[PDB]
Amino acid sequence: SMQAARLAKALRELGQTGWYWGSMTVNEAKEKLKEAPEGTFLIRDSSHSDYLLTISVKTSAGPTNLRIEYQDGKFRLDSIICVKSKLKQFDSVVHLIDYYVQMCKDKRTGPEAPRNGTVHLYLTKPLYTSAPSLQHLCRLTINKCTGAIWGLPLPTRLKDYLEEYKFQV
């Protein structure tokens, strides 16, 4: 299926992040986030039967957790927290994260909670499981500079690499 193909790719991108912690319990995430600055986040498998993945993030009050939903080929933040029309849907979960990160980088969202009940996710920097490759670190930097990788002075083989992961986080 074109659905199953998009989900395989979603999971492929996730393995590229360096901040996917796989099977990690909520209490291991709470320990690993305890001393981190506000907004530090990771993604990990959900221990819940109906959810694939969970975001764990440091707030000023300590680590908290937010599940990610997958329904009919699309990812969104758990619809328990808000009406679904306010929870943007994505084909890839790294793209979902990238969006919320760019939202805060662009100061279109801050650590203060909104008063009108819309979505309040303050994310700054990921928590890496290990040092990612130097290739990937360069890819992250080129993604933060431009989205037009096909006009770059680069061999086609390395543009295919940049195309496999277009995110800024």
Binding site: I142, C145, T146, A148, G151, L152, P153
Partner: protein
């Protein structure tokens, strides 16, 4: 604790690390193993200032926060026949101009 450094002379750079409590003399002992020049034939600098052999790197200013593995602090190195040479560090090549798309 750990301090990460580039020890530089002319066109030579050593990537090494030390402890913030390590002495300057301990640093020169590292240089000797790799460059085979005895410690008394060595002078080490932070910027344009000579470093007393008995100080710790900390008391010279090399903190962990300022000497990270991804951004090591630079130590200059000058060798001694009768005279000690001038401290001289050859710069790296300069990067090309950023392509327009990326500006």
């Amino acid at each position: 604790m750990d301090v990460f450094l580039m020890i530089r002379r002319h066109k030579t750079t050593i990537f090494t690390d030390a402890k913030e409590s390590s002495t300057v003399f301990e640093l020169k002992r590292i240089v000797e193993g790799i460059l085979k020049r005895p410690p008394d034939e060595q002078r080490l600098y932070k910027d344009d200032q000579l470093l007393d052999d008995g100080k710790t790197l900390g008391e010279c200013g090399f903190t962990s926060q300022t000497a990270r593995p991804q951004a090591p602090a630079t130590v200059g190195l000058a060798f001694r026949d009768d005279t000690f040479e001038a401290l001289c560090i050859e710069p790296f090549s300069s990067p090309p101009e950023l392509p327009d798309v990326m500006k």
